[PDB]
PDB file of C-alpha atoms and ligand atoms in Angstrom:
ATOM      1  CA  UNK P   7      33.545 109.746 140.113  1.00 45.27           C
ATOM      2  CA  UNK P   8      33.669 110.211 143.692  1.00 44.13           C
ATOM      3  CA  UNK P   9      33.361 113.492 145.272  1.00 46.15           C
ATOM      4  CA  UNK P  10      36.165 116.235 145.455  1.00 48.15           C
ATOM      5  CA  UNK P  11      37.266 116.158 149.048  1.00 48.40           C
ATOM      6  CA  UNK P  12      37.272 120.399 150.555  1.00 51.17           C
ATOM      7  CA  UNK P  13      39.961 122.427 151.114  1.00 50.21           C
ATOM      8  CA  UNK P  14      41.490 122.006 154.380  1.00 51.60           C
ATOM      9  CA  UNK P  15      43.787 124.390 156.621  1.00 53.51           C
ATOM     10  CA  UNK P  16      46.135 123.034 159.399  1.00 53.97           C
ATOM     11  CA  UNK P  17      48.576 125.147 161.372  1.00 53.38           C
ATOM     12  CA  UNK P  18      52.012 123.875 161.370  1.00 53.23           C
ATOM     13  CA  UNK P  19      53.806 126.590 163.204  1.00 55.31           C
ATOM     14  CA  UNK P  20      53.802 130.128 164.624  1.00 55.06           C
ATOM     15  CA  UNK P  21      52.814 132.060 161.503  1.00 51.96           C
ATOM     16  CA  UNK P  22      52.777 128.868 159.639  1.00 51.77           C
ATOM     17  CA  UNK P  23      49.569 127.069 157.853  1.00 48.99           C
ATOM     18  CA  UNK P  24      49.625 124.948 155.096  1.00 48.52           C
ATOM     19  CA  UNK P  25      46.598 124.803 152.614  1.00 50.13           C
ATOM     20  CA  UNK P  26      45.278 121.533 150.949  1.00 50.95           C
ATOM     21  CA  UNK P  27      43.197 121.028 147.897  1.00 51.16           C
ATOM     22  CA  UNK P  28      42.225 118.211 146.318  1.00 53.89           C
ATOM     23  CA  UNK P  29      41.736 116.416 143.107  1.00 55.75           C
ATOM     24  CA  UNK P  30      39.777 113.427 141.690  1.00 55.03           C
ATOM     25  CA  UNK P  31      42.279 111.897 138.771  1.00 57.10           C
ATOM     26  CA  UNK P  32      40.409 108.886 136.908  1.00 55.75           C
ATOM     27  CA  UNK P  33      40.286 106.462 136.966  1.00 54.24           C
ATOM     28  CA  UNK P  34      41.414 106.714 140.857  1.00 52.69           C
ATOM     29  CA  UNK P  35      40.506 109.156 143.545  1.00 53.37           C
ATOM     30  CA  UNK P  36      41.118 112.269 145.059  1.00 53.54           C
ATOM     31  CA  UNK P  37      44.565 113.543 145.423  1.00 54.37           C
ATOM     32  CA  UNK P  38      46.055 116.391 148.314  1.00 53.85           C
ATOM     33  CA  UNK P  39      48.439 119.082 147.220  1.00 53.72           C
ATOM     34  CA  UNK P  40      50.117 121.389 149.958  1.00 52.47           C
ATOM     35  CA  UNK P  41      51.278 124.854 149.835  1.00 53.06           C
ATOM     36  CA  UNK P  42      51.916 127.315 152.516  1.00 57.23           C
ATOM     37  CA  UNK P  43      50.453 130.503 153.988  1.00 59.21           C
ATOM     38  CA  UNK P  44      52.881 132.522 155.988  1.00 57.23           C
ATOM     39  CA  UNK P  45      51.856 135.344 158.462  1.00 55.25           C
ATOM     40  CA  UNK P  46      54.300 138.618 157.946  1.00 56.39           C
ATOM     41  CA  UNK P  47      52.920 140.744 160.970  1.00 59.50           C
ATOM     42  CA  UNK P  48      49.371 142.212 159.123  1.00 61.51           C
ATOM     43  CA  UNK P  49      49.557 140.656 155.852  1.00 62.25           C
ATOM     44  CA  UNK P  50      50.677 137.102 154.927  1.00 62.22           C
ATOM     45  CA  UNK P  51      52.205 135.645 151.841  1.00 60.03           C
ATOM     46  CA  UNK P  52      51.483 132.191 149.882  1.00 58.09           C
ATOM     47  CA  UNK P  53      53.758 129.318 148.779  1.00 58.01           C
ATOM     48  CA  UNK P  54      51.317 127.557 145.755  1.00 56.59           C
ATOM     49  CA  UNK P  55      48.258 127.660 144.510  1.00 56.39           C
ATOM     50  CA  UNK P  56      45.805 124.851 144.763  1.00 52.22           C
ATOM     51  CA  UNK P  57      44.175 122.827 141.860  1.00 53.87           C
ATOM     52  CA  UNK P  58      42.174 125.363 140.666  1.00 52.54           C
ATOM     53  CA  UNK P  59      40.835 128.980 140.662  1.00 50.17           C
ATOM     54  CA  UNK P  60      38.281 127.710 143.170  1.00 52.76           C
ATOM     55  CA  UNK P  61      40.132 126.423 145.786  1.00 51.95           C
ATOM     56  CA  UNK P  62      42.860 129.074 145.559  1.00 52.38           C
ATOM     57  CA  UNK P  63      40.057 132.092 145.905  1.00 54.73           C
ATOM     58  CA  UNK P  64      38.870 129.905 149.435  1.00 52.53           C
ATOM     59  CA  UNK P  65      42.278 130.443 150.765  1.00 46.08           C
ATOM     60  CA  UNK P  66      42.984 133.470 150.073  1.00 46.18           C
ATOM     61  CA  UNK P  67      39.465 134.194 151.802  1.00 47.31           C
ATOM     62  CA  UNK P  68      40.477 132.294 154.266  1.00 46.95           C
ATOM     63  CA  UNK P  69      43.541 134.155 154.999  1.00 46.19           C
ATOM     64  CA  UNK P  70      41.640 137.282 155.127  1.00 49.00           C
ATOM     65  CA  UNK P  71      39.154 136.104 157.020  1.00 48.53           C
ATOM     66  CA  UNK P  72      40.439 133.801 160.076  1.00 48.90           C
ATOM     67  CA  UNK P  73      43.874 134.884 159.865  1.00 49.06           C
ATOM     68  CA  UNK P  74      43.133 139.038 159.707  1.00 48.51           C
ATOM     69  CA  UNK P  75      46.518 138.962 157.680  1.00 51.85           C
ATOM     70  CA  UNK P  76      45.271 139.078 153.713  1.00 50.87           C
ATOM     71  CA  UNK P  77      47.604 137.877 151.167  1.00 51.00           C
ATOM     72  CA  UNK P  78      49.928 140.362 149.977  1.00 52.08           C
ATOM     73  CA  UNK P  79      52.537 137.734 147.832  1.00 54.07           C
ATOM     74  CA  UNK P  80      52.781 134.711 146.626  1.00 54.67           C
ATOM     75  CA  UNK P  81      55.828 132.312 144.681  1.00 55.47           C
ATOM     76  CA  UNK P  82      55.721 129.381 143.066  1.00 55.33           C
ATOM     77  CA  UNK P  83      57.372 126.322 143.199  1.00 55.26           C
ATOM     78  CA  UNK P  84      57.255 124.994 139.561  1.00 56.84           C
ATOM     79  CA  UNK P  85      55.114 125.039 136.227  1.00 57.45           C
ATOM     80  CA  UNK P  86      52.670 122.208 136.833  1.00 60.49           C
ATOM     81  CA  UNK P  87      49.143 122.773 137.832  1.00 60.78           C
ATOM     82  CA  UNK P  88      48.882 121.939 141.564  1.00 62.53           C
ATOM     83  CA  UNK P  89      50.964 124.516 141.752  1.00 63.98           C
ATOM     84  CA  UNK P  90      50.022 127.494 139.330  1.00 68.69           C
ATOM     85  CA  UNK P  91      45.971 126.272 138.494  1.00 70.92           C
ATOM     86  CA  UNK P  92      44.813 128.975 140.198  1.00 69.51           C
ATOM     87  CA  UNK P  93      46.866 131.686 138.781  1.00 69.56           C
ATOM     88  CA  UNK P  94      43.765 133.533 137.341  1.00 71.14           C
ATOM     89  CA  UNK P  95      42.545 133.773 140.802  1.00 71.94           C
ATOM     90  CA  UNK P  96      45.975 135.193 142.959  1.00 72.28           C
ATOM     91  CA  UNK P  97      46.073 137.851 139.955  1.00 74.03           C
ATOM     92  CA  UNK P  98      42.265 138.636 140.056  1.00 72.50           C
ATOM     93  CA  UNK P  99      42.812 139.136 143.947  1.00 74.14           C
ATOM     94  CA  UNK P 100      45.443 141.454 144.234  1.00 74.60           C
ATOM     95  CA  UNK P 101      48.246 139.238 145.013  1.00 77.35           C
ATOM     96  CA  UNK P 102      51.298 139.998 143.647  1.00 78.05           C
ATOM     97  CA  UNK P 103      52.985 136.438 142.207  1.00 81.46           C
ATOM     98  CA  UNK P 104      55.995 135.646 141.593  1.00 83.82           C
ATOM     99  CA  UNK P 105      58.253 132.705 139.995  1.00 83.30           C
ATOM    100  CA  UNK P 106      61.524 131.770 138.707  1.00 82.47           C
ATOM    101  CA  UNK P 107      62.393 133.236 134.602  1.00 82.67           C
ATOM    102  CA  UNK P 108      62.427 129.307 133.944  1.00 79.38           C
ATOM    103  CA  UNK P 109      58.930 128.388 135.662  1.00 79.16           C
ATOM    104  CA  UNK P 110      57.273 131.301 133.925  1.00 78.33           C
ATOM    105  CA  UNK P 111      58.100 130.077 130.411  1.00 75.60           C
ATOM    106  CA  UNK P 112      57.379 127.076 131.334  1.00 77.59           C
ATOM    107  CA  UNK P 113      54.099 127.469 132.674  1.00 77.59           C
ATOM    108  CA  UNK P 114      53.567 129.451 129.400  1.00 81.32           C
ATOM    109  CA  UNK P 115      54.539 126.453 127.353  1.00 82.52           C
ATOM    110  CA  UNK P 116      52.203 123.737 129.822  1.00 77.25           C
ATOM    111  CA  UNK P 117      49.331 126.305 129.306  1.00 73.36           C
ATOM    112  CA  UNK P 118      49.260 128.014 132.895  1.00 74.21           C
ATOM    113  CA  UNK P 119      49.160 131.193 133.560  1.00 71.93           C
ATOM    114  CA  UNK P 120      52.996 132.861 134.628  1.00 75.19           C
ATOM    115  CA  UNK P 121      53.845 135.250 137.008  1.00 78.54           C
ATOM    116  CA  UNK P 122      54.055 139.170 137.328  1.00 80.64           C
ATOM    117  CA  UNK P 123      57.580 139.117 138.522  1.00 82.84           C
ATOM    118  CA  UNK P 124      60.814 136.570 138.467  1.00 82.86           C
ATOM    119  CA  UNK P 125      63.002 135.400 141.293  1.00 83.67           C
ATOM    120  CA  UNK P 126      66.733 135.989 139.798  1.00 83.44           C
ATOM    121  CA  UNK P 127      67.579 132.377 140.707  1.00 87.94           C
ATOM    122  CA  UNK P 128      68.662 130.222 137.753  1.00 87.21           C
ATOM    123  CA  UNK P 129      72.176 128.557 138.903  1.00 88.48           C
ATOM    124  CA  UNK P 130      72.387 125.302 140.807  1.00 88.81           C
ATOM    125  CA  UNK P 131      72.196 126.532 144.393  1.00 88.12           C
ATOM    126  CA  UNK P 132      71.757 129.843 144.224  1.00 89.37           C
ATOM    127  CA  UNK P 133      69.653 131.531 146.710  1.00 89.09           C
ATOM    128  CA  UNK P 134      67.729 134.369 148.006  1.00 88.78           C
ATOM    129  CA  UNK P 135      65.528 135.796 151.150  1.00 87.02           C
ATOM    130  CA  UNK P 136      61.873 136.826 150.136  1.00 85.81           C
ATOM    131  CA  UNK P 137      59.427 137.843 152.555  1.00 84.64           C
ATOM    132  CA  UNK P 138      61.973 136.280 155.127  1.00 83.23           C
ATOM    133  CA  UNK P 139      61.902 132.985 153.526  1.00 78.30           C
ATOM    134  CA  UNK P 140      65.179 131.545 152.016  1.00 78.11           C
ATOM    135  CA  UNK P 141      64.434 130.348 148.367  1.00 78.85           C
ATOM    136  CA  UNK P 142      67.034 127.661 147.290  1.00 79.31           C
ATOM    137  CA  UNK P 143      67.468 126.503 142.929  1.00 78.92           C
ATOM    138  CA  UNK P 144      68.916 123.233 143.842  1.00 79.64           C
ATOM    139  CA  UNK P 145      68.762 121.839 140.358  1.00 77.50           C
ATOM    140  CA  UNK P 146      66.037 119.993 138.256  1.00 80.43           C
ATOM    141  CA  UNK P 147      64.420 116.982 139.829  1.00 81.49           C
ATOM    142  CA  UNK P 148      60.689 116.466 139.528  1.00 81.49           C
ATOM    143  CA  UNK P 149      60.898 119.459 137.655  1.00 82.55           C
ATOM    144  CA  UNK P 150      63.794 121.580 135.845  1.00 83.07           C
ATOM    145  CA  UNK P 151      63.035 124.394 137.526  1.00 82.60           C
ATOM    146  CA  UNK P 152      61.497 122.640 140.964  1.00 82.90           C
ATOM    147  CA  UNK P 153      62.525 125.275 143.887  1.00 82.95           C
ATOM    148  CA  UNK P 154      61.878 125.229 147.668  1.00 84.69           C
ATOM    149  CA  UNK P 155      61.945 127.310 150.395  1.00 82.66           C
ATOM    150  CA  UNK P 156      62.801 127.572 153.707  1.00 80.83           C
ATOM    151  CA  UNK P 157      61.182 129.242 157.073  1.00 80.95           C
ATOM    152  CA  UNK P 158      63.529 129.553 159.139  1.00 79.65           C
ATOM    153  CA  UNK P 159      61.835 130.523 162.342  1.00 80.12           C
ATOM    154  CA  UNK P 160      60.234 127.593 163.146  1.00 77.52           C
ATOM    155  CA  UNK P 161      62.574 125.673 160.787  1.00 75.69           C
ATOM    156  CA  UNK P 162      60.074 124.177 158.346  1.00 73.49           C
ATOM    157  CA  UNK P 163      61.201 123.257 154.790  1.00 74.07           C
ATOM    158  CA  UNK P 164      58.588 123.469 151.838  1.00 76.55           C
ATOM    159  CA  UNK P 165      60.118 121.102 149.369  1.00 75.77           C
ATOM    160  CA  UNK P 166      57.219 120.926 147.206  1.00 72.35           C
ATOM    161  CA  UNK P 167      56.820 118.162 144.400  1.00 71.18           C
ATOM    162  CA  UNK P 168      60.622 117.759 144.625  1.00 71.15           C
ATOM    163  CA  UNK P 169      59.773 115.732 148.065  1.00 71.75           C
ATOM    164  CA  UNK P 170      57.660 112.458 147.612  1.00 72.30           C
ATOM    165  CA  UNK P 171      55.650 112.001 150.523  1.00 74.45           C
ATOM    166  CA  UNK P 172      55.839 109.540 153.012  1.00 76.63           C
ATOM    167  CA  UNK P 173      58.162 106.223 152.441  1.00 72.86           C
ATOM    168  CA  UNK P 174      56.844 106.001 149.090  1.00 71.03           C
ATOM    169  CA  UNK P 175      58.466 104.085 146.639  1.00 70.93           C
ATOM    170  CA  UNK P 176      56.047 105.984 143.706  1.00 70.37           C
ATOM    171  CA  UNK P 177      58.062 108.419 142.015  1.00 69.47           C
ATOM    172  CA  UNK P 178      54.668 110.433 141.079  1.00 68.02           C
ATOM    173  CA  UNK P 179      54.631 112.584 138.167  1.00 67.74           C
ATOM    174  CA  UNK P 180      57.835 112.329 136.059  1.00 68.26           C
ATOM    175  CA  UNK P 181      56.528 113.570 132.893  1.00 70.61           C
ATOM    176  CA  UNK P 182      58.701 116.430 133.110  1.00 70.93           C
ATOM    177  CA  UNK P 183      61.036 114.772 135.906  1.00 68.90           C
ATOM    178  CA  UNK P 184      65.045 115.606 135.326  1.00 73.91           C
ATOM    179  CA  UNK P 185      65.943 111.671 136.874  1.00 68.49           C
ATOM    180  CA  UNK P 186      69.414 112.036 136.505  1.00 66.19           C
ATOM    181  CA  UNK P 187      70.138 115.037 138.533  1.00 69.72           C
ATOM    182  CA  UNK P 188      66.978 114.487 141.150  1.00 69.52           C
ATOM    183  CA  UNK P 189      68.451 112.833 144.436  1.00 70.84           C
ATOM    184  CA  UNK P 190      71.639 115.511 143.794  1.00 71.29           C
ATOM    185  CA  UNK P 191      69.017 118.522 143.936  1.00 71.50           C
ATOM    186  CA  UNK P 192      67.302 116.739 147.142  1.00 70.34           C
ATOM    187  CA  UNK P 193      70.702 117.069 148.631  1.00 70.20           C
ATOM    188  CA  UNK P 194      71.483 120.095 148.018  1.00 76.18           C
ATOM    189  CA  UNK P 195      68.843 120.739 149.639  1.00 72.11           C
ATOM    190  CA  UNK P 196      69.232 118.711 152.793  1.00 73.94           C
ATOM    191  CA  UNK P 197      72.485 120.753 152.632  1.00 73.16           C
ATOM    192  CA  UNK P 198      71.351 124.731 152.046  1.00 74.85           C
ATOM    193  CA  UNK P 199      69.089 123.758 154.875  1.00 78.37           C
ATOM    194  CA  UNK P 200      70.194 121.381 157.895  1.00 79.85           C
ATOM    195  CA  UNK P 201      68.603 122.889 160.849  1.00 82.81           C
ATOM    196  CA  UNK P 202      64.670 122.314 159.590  1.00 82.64           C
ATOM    197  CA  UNK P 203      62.704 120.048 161.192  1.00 80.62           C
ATOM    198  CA  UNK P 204      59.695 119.815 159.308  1.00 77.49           C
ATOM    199  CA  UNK P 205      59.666 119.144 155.889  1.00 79.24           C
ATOM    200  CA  UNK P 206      56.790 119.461 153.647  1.00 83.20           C
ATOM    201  CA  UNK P 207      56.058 117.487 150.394  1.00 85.31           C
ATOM    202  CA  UNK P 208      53.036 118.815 148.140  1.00 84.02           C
ATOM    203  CA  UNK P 209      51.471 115.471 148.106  1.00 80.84           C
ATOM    204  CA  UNK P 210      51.718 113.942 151.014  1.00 79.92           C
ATOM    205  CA  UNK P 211      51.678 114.684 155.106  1.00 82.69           C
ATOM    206  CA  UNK P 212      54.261 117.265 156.974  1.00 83.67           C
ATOM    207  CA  UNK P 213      57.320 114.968 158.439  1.00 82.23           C
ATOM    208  CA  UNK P 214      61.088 115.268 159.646  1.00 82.15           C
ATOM    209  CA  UNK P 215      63.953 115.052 157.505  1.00 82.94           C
ATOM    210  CA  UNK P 216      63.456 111.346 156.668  1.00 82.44           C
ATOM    211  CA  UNK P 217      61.011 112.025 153.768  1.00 80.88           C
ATOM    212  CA  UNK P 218      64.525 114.172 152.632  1.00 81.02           C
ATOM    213  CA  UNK P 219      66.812 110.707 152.877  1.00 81.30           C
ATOM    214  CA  UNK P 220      63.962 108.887 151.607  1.00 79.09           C
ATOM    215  CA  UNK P 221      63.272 110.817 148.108  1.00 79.92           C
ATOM    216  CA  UNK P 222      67.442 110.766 147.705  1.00 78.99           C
ATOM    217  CA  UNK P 223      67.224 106.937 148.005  1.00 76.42           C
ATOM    218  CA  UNK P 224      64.314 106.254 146.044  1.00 76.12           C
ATOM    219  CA  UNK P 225      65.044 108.992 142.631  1.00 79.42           C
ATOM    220  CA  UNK P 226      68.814 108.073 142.761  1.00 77.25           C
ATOM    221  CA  UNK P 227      70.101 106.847 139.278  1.00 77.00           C
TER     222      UNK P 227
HETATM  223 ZN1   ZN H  18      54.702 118.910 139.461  1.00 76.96          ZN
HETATM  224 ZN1   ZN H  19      52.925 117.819 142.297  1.00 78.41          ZN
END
């Protein structure tokens, strides 16, 4: 197969730098997923693994490293593995991880590893602030228990998986997809949060709010 591309780092704001790994999926090739690493004055905390305990040990490193602001936190944006695959490696580094009731069980039940502590969201819309980041349930989509989160400083949205990348017309993933309530969730989100500018998806590049229009269009019923 062809090679695995590296792990890649780009900044996207003051305080804000989103991670990339990369995996080769046969019979095709390589494919990115983004998370977030988010500076807190000394320390920093973590939206998503990568793939793997590989590339999630690299940035953490990284963060210690370049950024002088080691990871204290993480959370998790739902129970697949581009998400939670390196797990083993957050927990084996000190970081303290945490997830939704719902993503830890399932993450149990997809084989991934959960946890150490749960974010009391569980009702459609319901909210919270962690580590100064807004973290919105806005209802199953690509996942039941999909979540994203919001920076409001520089007014960047992390919408994960729940956000397809690009104009796509691919819905990705929908093994575990909930396609009748998906383009409601994306709104809700669009809603919780109107004044971000940048919106991330995990599998594609950072845009505006048209990748949030676009995902409602294309998952609608
Ligand atoms: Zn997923
Ligand atoms: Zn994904």
């Amino acid at each position: 197969g062809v090679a695995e591309k590296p792990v890649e780092f780009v900044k996207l704001g003051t305080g804000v730098w989103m991670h990339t790994g990369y995996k080769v999926v046969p019979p095709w090739g390589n494919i990115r997923t983004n998370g977030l690493i988010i500076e807190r004055g000394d320390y920093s905390v973590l939206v998503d693994t990568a793939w793997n305990d590989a590339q999630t040990a690299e940035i953490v490193a990284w963060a210690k490293d370049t950024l002088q602001k080691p990871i204290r936190a993480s959370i998790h944006t739902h129970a697949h593995s581009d998400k939670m695959g390196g797990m083993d490696a957050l927990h084996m580094l000190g970081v303290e991880t945490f997830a939704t009731d719902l993503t830890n069980r399932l993450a149990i039940e997809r084989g991934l590893m959960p946890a150490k502590n749960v974010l009391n969201i569980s009702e459609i819309g319901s909210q919270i602030e962690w580590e100064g980041l807004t973290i919105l349930y806005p209802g199953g989509g690509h996942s039941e228990d999909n979540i994203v989160v919001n920076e409001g400083v520089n007014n960047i949205l992390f919408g994960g998986c729940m956000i397809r990348p690009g104009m796509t017309t691919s819905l990705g993933n929908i093994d575990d997809a909930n396609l009748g309530y998906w383009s409601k969730a994306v709104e809700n989100a669009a809603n919780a949060f109107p004044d971000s500018q940048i919106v991330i998806p995990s599998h594609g590049k950072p845009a505006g709010r048209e990748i949030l229009k676009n995902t409602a269009y294309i998952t609608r019923p």
